[PDB]
Design a protein around this ligand. Structure first.
Ligand code: 0IH
Ligand code: 0IH
Ligand code: 0IH
Lengths: 216, 215
């Protein structure tokens, strides 16, 4: 019985997890909730044995999880990708948190009616945040060096989202532009992005001020 | 001796301080005051940090930023993250569910519309609290008989939501008892009555909620 990954039919909180599963060639099935399927979720929400019912959820023959970060880390942990010692695990959690500062920075203003205003403050800080990853990639192919880790897929998703908010945000960051193309050049990722399983849009929920709507 | 650098506020690092106090580990704090933002900007890129930010954690083995990497590093050095992928995922799920509450406060704490956003937040908060109340039905702490780092994160979230509404836990007796139980841990009690405890601010001095020099 393959694992089940449940979420809205958006990129949202789960997109890096989908990319990690595809990179690892892990079989999984999805429960997808469309824009008019809130009732289908409410009817299912307390029938999965989840201790903290929420979207996304991940169910296999061992665990029944919620919290997107617990889920992506669980998949990485099963593949010995979280780090071999406290120092390496901390480096990976620091990369993870620095990516979340960008991704959550988008989300925390995406549902406000006055998104346009708060977007200015976020975009004034975005370059300094991106510069830290540009520098990290100065002598590393991926965020943790020679091999892919789950924060690479988190960073890839963050770049995809911020490029919709500001199509020029990577004009000063050639290593980040190259990094994004490098992730797209991973055979598993390329196959996934060109597949029927890929959800291009929306980025946030359908009613969000930014990253919403049925189409870009 | 580790150095924990942060604003002289509870903020992102308060659960980390509580965990260090619970474990009785020595550490030095480099606290940045209300008018010291310039001093931080001037040194930010000279500390050997890969992702300069507040809080930072400097010890003989690592130079870290991101509050969750720091708290997990301290827990990891004490073998507290979980003994297998299933247990580690349970602990990460507990931490994420606490963060939904703590960050739900931070999301609205800087808005001029905090008073209106507070109504909506306190209306959604009981559903989040109920999951923790049920978790504590047959558990002393969030992961059973022994303390884990999400217990100090939950303690901090409860401390902060009680400043937003002192009666928001009255229908959640297991959460009220949990908060009291954490305060009854001798090393926590000692820390809370010490000169090292920072009671306020919660979000930074200019925040609409959890700001100002005193509560
Ligand atoms: O209330 C919540 O669940 C969140 C509150 C919240 C806002 C900001 C931040 Cl920093 C953290 C939490 C927002 N949210 C989310 C997502 C959050 C993050 C990311 Cl990334 S996505 N996904 C949604 C996904 C779907 C729906 C929804 C489903 C059916 C019909 C309409 C919607 C809808 N109505 N508003 N926008 N879309 C909602 C959310 C959503 O509110
Ligand atoms: O927390 C930090 O800022 C650093 C932590 C740290 C320790 C060791 C290492 Cl290998 C890297 C980072 C220490 N530090 C520094 C440094 C600059 C660059 C390196 Cl490398 S060490 N300069 C300082 C410059 C001035 C001040 C200061 C000046 C006047 C009055 C008070 C202080 C003050 N009140 N609290 N802590 N410092 C402090 C530092 C300092 O702590
Ligand atoms: O830009 C940022 O740093 C954050 C942006 C941000 C807002 C909301 C969310 Cl969901 C996530 C990120 C907010 N913030 C923070 C804290 C965030 C979380 C927690 Cl918990 S605390 N601590 C601060 C601590 C101190 C200061 C500050 C320092 C010197 C003088 C004034 C301030 C100040 N000015 N506004 N309120 N206080 C700022 C922040 C701060 O903005």
């Amino acid at each position: 019985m393959s694992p089940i990954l449940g979420y809205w039919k958006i990129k949202g909180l789960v997109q890096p997890t989908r990319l990690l599963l595809e990179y690892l060639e892990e079989k999984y099935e999805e429960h997808l909730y469309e824009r008019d399927e809130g009732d289908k979720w409410r009817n299912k929400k307390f029938e999965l044995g989840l201790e903290f019912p929420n979207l996304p959820y991940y169910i296999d023959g061992d665990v029944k999880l919620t919290q997107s970060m617990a889920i992506i880390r669980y998949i990485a942990d099963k593949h010995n990708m979280l780090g071999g010692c406290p120092k390496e695990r901390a480096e990976i959690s620091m990369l993870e948190g620095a990516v979340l500062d960008i991704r959550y920075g988008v989300s925390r203003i995406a549902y406000s009616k006055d998104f346009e205003t708060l977007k200015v403050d976020f975009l004034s800080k975005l370059p300094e945040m991106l510069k830290m990853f540009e520098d990290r990639l100065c002598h590393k192919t991926y965020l943790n060096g020679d091999h892919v880790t789950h924060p690479d897929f988190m960073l890839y998703d963050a770049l995809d989202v911020v490029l919709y908010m500001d199509p020029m945000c990577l004009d000063a960051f050639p290593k980040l532009v190259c990094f994004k193309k490098r992730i797209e050049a991973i055979p598993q990722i390329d196959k996934y992005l060109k597949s029927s399983k890929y959800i291009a849009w929306p980025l946030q929920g359908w009613q969000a001020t930014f990253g919403g709507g049925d189409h870009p």
